[PDB]
Design a protein around this ligand. Structure first.
Ligand SMILES: [Rh+3]
Ligand SMILES: [Rh+3]
Length: 124
């Protein structure tokens, strides 16, 4: 199937641009990453740093994950991100999101060889 690393990149990586400049960014990206296919995924974060900079987080600050595993890592630096959150009136199949831009540390779970992000835990 899709590898865990590849699912992380499809759900969370949008290196493309430095910022989500359009208020429709989330509506279009949540569609284009297949996160509105069968249901509207309610909450999702996209990261606007290079893949190398995101993978490098796996050698930065070790922290526990929300699930109590200890393979989570916090970025030392803040990163450009877009938070996508479904509106209160959003109804599949016409999934509707508010786009928020931020500059926050990311927390990711890392696994595998190569040792790379497989889950987005949080932004702080
Ligand atoms: Rh996960
Ligand atoms: Rh998962």
């Amino acid at each position: 199937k899709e590898t865990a690393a590849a699912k992380f990149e499809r759900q969370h990586m949008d290196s493309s641009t430095s910022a989500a400049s359009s208020s429709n960014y989330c509506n279009q990206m949540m569609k284009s990453r297949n996160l509105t296919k069968d249901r509207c995924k309610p909450v999702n974060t996209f990261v606007h740093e290079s893949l190398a900079d995101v993978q490098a987080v796996c050698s930065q600050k070790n922290v526990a994950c929300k699930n109590g595993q200890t393979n989570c890592y916090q970025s030392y630096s803040t990163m450009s991100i877009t938070d996508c959150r479904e509106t209160g009136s959003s109804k599949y199949p016409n999934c509707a999101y508010k786009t928020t831009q931020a500059n926050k540390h990311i927390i990711v779970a890392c696994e595998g060889n190569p040792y790379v992000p497989v889950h987005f835990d949080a932004s702080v």
